[model samples]
Structures are given as structure tokens and as C-alpha cells.
Target: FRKMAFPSGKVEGCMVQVTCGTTTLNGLWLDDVVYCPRHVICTSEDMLNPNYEDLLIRKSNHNFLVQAGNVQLRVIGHSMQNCVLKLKVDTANPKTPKYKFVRIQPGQTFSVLACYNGSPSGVYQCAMRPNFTIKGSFLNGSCGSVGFNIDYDCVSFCYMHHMELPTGVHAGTDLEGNFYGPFVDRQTAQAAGTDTTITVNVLAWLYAAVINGDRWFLNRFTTTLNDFNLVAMKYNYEPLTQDHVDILGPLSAQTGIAVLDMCASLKELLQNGMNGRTILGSALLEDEFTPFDVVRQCS
Candidate 1:
């Protein structure tokens, strides 16, 4: 019974114990593949609580949360009933804001994973995303936030997530509360010192530099970070506060997605650091630039 969850391929066979009730059951991990596995866990309560991940995103007063672990995504209806949502993800372009859609039912407490059939890590993150449109069939209190981990400016970037902008989501928000849409475009935002691109470009520059000709990381790194700062600054700055109800309604604060994207990109950092300091499969930059400066400097 408990032996069934943890399949045989990987992170399997070892039985772990947890108290389901009075029974001390030893159910092997269904999937905790990586030693410090890649995954996320979210709940409705964490969304509303100001002290947690606070992924209580909303559109049209209907709220939900999405979780991405390794290469899967889950949607939580937050005690709301009869929930129908269109989940989106792009298998090809990671930067794309589009993807397949799925319907999620009333999640009394937990979440539902985004569907995908791939090599797991290949199309995992990009193909499992949330849509701007959310729907609910039954009744529930206000769209609260979520409690999720695996990060998003989780510690620092979360500071401003709770704040709201002046103009609102007509366009998008910046790191500050300035609006970016028909009212104020990039040129205007930059002129007014509220441009999100300032942060975007900086991230782009660093990311591009990190690639160092490794095609695998070139696009993935820059675009993910570029888009991360771009959107986070936009929504974090623009989502209308609950106080400004009626027009834009309420905007959900985010901390999970950006952190996910950031972490994904950081793999390059870890690799490069290892490559530069240690003898890695790929040669280090300092070595080639100076031909292993110390070892064969004249070469």
C-alpha cells in the first residue's frame, strides 16, 4: 500500500514514515528524486497571510495559486468552489506568455498540477504557467494569497509585493507605483524615472555575459532574467491595491514565479563559478583568456 507511491526509477525504494493519523505509515516517497529535490508546495492560507509567499493572485475577483516543481505546475482554487481556469505554457519559447490550458476544480485546501508530457526538465518550467483569465463556479471569500516555497525574491523582492501603484494595470507597473500602458510607455517611464527596463537591461547585460558561447544557456539565461525583472517590476508596481476596489479590482502579490525564473537562470552562475575556480568539464574563461594564466600563460 505505502510502497506504491515511490516508483522505482529514482528517489525510490527508500520508505519514509509520516503519521497520517494513529497509524505510523511508511510510504516511500512518490518522487523526491533530487537529494534536495526540485519542487514547490503551496496552500490557500499562505496566499492571504502577509508573512508568507503570498501568491494570492487574482483577476475579476477570482483568485488562485500556481506551483512549479522540477517541471510541473499546480493550481489551487483556495477553498473556492467549481473553479475553471485556463493554464498557459510554451514548450518552445521560454519567454512566451502562452501555453496549453486545463480546467481545475474546487481545491478545498491543496493544489492541482499543470499537465505536460515531456522529458520533465526540458519543457517543465516554460510549458507550465498561469493565465490572466481565472474563473470560479461556487462561492468563497475574497481571493486570498498562498503559501509557496522554492522562492521568488522570496526574502527581499517580497518587500514591495504588497504595495500598489497609482495608475493601475491599464498597462503594467514598474519597480515603483508608476503605471505603464497607453498612459505612460517605456520612453515616458524612463523620462519619469519609473522605467522597469532599467532593471531589465541590467539583468540582460549580466545574463548575456554569463553565456560565454554556451548556446544551451545563451538565450535561456538572458531571456528568463530579462523577463523576470520586467514582469515582476510591472505587476509589483502596478497591481491595484484592495483599497482601490471597483475599477481594477485587486491585484495579487507575487513572489514565487520571479524567484523560480531567477533560480533557473542562476544555474549558469553556479556552473560558471565551478568552471572558473575548479577543473570542470567545460574550460574556464580566465584559463582560456590567459591560457590557464598560471599553468600556460605564454600559450
Candidate 2:
């Protein structure tokens, strides 16, 4: 009815439910579709989902039946105002991994699925990924930090994705509530730590060895592990905490459009995980490599 007021901005994340007489219809986000309402009544960002669309009906004095998708609605008597609407959106409790990552906080807890090949089996931990570059590094390196607790000491490498240092939208205030941002340009825009590279390189070395069914590479680079933990956490899990949003929002805004699209795609990948699918397309057992041995041997 015209008496209801919709929220501002893109209505892309909420669930909408509509009721008319004995008929009830409900769906997640709305998609764009035209109907026979003289004027558009709902205000929301136009989105595309291919499976659903909004059905709008104008106010009329005649009783009729309105069909919306599979649901049927009856306009009892002459009053269209008999319709009722309810919206249910609980960002606090997302049913899927995509939504789960959105509400995950800095210290949120999760575990690596045991089904994954070469994982740190039966170990539950934490992690905090700050940007895409770290994620890329971890994936390419084949580390086992996914689903581990991420500590706060690894923020130094958060800007490796940018050619120029990015300004944090709301930089610091860690678990300790300290101001960690508005740092100097030189401090913000440096390359990743040598140790980070070493850890990633060793992990990649091992993954390559295992994938090729060879142990030489594993024995060759059983070297490396500190900033590595922090960086790994950032990439393996995506969290939508206020600090993360504040820091990442500006990066998304400042970077090329491709960066934004990539982040969205990553979310999609996580969404797929929620649905019981892995992006790698096959199950993998965690590979083992001793950091001490790799560094000592590779050295």
C-alpha cells in the first residue's frame, strides 16, 4: 500500500514479502521487471537475477485476482488496501557463507573443512585478510591458513594491492582500540615483507611438488612461517566488519573498477562454498611442509 515507506539506497540485500488476501509471495532481492501499474511505486536500484521480478498493481475499486509468479492474490471486495507487506532481513544471521562472511567480525571464529585435501585437519583457528594481493599470494602459494584465526599485527601489508599507498577509510582501533591510520605515504605503500614472500614461495613450492606428485620440491623448500599468518588469514576468509569495510571501501572506491568487480566475484566464490562447492573443482588433502626445514634447506 501507499502507506508503507521503503528504505533508501540499493535494496539489493533484503528479503521482501507481500501478502494479498489469502495469497503470500516472498523472495530475496528484487529484480527488474515491468508490470501494468500506471506509475512505478517501489523505489530501489535496478538489479538482475533472471529468476524473479517484482509485480506491481495499481489501486482500483474493482475486486480481482492478481497472479505473481506461482502465487495467486485476490483483491477482496473493492479495496486493494487489503494487501499486507513484510520485509525480513537479518544481516546478523546470514543463512549462507556469502552472507556469513559479510557479518564476520575481526575476531570471528571458523574452521577449515576437513573434507579439503591437505588441510590442517581438525584444527579451528582465526585469520584476517586485508586485501586482494595477500589473497592472491596465499592461493598461489598453497598455504593451510584458511579457517585459522588472523591476528592484528599483519595490517602493515594491507596496501600491497595498490601501486600507490591507499588511505584507510577508518584505519586503526584494533582489538585494543588504537589509532593505526593516516600513516605516512612511504609507510603505507611498500612491498610485502621479505618473510611474507619467503613463506608464500615455500608454500607454492610445496603445492607444486604435491600437485606434480613429487616430494623433492617439498623437501627442497620446507622453509618459512609471522606476517605470513596474518596475510593468510586476510585472504582465506572474507569478513565484512566495520573496520574492514571502512578500510576496504575507500580502496574499492579509489582503485580501478576491475578491483571492485573482482571483490564481488570473490564474494560469489565464497557464496559457492556456502552451497557445498569448492572453487578448485576437486577435493585436495592438505600438503605438509616444515617451515624450519624449507628455510634451512632453501637457504
Candidate 3:
């Protein structure tokens, strides 16, 4: 069996036919016809009597009479101006129920009829909304509003925090394989026209390592400079490529000695200083000093 809904209005006529068995059965035939009657029970006489009546009948012994049974619903709304209709099936549970949306515009009429096997059973709700909007609120049955609004850049930062460079590579890299660190590098310390290439390169590496959590790079850096005599000699001469291995080798070997000197110096200062408080205060306020940025104090 099947159910249907049709538009309704005054002086409008609808036709419905009943068929038995499937189309493949040549013996199948029509069993009956139904017509909608106008009703005038309303206060206005314009509304005639509204009802349905069987218009045709079929005799028994018809080859397909055994399968005879079918019904269809038709409706015509008197008004259909700003109205829209929709249908929804209960996918969550087939037994739950189904619903429909019907819009009756001004000066329009509609009708509904149905045919089914045995008893036509299931919950059904009809709803209507304005043509201007795609969503509508449920009227008869308990149903929520259905609609959505999307704006530009709605998901702009949804995954921003997860963005990252490929493993083992930093976010940005520079020529000569050097990396940029969190802090700005001062390149203006160079003498005119001369390239302080080695100093700049080492400083860049140190800065990048610090920013990227490469603590070992710091120790390696200090050792490299110490071996190159840069720390002891205090930038007396520019760095040479040939000095790399030699400087770093000696620095690595003498690191223990250098550490001992550092510890001894601290011990002496602490022993002779005013107090632990004074020592900490002095260190906190100590002059900002960097070997590369230092100017020799000619005595």
C-alpha cells in the first residue's frame, strides 16, 4: 500500500484508483475508485461538505482479486503562498515514527489519502515553514528546530596549534645551514668591508641551539672558543677555517682545567666577599658583557 498528499483548493477535483497484484500479473485489475466530497459544515457556506466515498467496486472471482487491497491519500491546500513541505523518516528506529512538512499558502487548498496492507500504522507528524527559510519548527509533534548558519573563517584556527615542521628540521633555516634563534643577532659589530664570517657563523649556531633547546651545543660552543684561544685572548684575532679542529681539540682537552678555574674563582670571591647576599646581589646587577661586543680597555 502507498500513501500520498495532494494540493487542495475550491472547485478542484482529484482522482484515485485501486489496483490489485503487481504489474507483472496480467490478471491484475482495478478494484475501486474514491472521490473527495466538499463540506459546508463550516460557518461559511462557501465551504461545502467535505468527506470521502467509494466510487467503484469489483466483483469476486477476479484472477487477481486474492491480492486486492490498495489505498492512496491525496490533499490540496487552499493556500500555498509562503509555505514549504518536507518529509523525514525515523532512521534511528524504524518503529519510532515518521513525519512530514506541509505548507498551505494563502488562497490554496491541499488533500491527503493513503492505502496500506492490513492496518496503516506508525506515528507521523506534518510541519510547515516559510519559503524564505530552509529550516522550520515542528508544530504538532515534539520536534526541535533544524537549521545551521555558517560564516567565513569559521574554522580559521581549528588546527593552528598542531602545525609543525617535519621532524629533525627547524621551522626556518638560513643559508650556510645556520638557523635563526629566538633572539636577534647584532651583525653591525663588523669592521667596514671585512667579513667576520667565522664569528658570525659560530654566534648564529650558538643562538639557534639555545633557542631550540640544544644545551649540548652551548657546552660545545664554549669549548670551541676556549680551544681557539678566543676566550683567553679575547677576540685578539679573527677566526680561520684551519683553526677549527686545532682550537676545538685543545679546548675539549682543557675543559676540566677551565672548569676548575671557574670554580676556584667563584670560591675565592665567595670567601672574600661581604656575604652570600652581597655576592648574589652583585652577580644579578653585574655589567652586561659579551666577548664579541667588548672593546679592549687600554691601560
Candidate 4:
């Protein structure tokens, strides 16, 4: 999949795995076995059949076609109930993007407001950079954007939760319902250097504390201050830390976007929802987060 080469032409996905891999199960099909290496499962049930029997059958609008040329695209909504077709930087559909559909609804074919031009600066158009991936979604997912990948188009999508950047890292919460973080600014770091092991910036947990109403989000924050390194001399009152002051100060001051709004944006940007059960580092916050934007709203 690391190979930087793709045949320059329009090779629709229906043709790609035309031969089904014999599933170890007897007489049972890999029913939901989506072979998307980069998460572009746009073609409903129309994508299977390795022997390509009903290749002619366009089930609920899940067919994805990969073309490399004066690139253009469209939809064959053969039963599609209107879906979004987004172009992301890497992998399927709308991780951090937006797009439109066509008049070709239910058996019609309206083409070419299509994308793919080998350029990267354009907006709403699929950019196939060597480092970029093209993804698509059809019926099953958020907002429905049918996409396909040109770069690294073979590594399947495997998402797991409670994953990546364990909350225990760089931050912690205490039973006191207080959020402590080495989360000070760069200026503070220059002042204390080795004087403080609390040099890591992780105020996100502070927001989490407010949202979850439990300082557990501050789990790692408290760990560092209590750990052998900081010597407990930094500040027994974790809330007094410069990092906490800068962020929590706003909510305390009762201003700006309000604590609730900040919490909502933070949830969508970081947790993706109430359960913190989405992909670890997804695009749910591509444009939804930024240190300045986050805390500024807090202010």
C-alpha cells in the first residue's frame, strides 16, 4: 500500500476485487466484509460478488469509481436517498470536508461537477496529493459522503474507542474535583525549565472536568503535580497553576461563549459525543478546535 503508483485511468471499484477471497466460513458470505483499505464504502450492496454476477446491479448507491484524468464525477442514485459526497485529505468522505450531489437521482446519471485534478489548493474538490487520501461514504455513516482514495487506497479502516493518547498522559484529575495540568504556557516553561516537570500543556482536560462534572478528566494533571518530580512544590492548589488560571478563569469570570457552549464545542471537537466513544484522533475537530479558539470562547 506504500507504493506511490496508480494506473492513470478510470478504474471503478466494482472491478477491483472482482474475485471474492474464499471466506473460511462454509456457505456463508463475508456479508458485511467491506474491503475498504482507506474507508470508501459508497456502493451499497452493489459492491460485492467477486465473480461479478450482478455487476450490472447498482444496489442502494454504493458504487465508488476511481478515475485519474481530466477528472470529473457524479452519482447513480439507483435507490440512493440523497447522500453527501465529500473530499477529504486522507481517507473516506467527510472527516473534515463538504460537497454536493446531482439531479441524477434514482436511475439518472448527471456527471462532471466532478473533482480530481492533481491540485491541492482547491476547495470542495478532491485533492489527490501524494500525502493525501480520497475517501467516500454512501448509506451508512455520518452525513453520507461517497469517496474513494487514490493514495494509500488499500489499508482498511479499523476504528476502536478509549483509544490513542490515553487520558492518563500529560493530564489528570483529582478527587477534589480539581483539574491540574503541567499545562502552563511556553513563557512559564522558559522561566522554570527543569524546575517544573509540570511543563506539559493539556488544558483540554479542564474543559472535560466541567463537562463530565467530575475531575476524572484531570486524571493525569493531578498525577504530575503529585508525582515525585514536581515535588508538590509547584502548587498544592492545582487550580492555581497558570494553565488552569488562563482557562478556568474565563468560566469563573462568567463571560464570552459561556461554559456550556465551550463544553459543547469541546465535546464535539474532542469527544465527538457524550461517551468519548468515537475514533481517537478523528477529523471531528479539524475546523472545530484550536487553542486560541477554544479558550477564547471560554473567555
Task: Write model 1 residue lDDT over 1-299, tens digit each, in one string.
Answer: 00011111221121122221121211112122101100011233332332212222422212212222233222222211111112222222222221111221111011111112111111010100111111211111111111111112121100001111232311221222222222222112211224221222222222233333332332243334344434445432222122212211111011112323433443454334444432213443211111011112111
How much is 30 displaced in model 2, in angstroms? 16
> Backbone collision count in every prediction?
12, 22, 41, 28
Candidate 2 lDDT by residue in tens digits, 150-241:
22311111111111223222111121112123222122343422211222222322333333344321111111223223434454532233
Candidate 1: clashing residue pairs, number: 12
Greater-TM-score candidate between 2 and 4: 2
Candidate 3 residue-wise lDDT, 1-299, digit = tens: 01122222110111122223331110101112111111101122221321112111121223122122343322212111111111111112211112222222111111211112211212211111111111111122111111111123121000000001212111111111111222111211211221122332233223322333433312222234345434322332233233333332332242332432322332233234434343222332121111111111110
Global local distance difference test of model 2:
0.24
lDDT of each: 0.21, 0.24, 0.20, 0.23
What digit string (tens of lDDT, one per residue) describes model 4 on residues 85-175?
1221112221211212111101110111111222111112121111111211111121111122232334111110000112211211111
Candidate 3: 10-residue stretch with minimal lDDT: 155-164
Q: For model 3, what is the C-alpha lDDT against the true structure? A: 0.20
Candidates ranked by TM-score: 2, 4, 1, 3
For candidate 4, what is the TM-score?
Answer: 0.17
Better of 1 and 4 by lDDT: 4
lDDT of 2 at 98: 25
Model 2: worst 10 consecutive residues (lDDT sum): 154-163
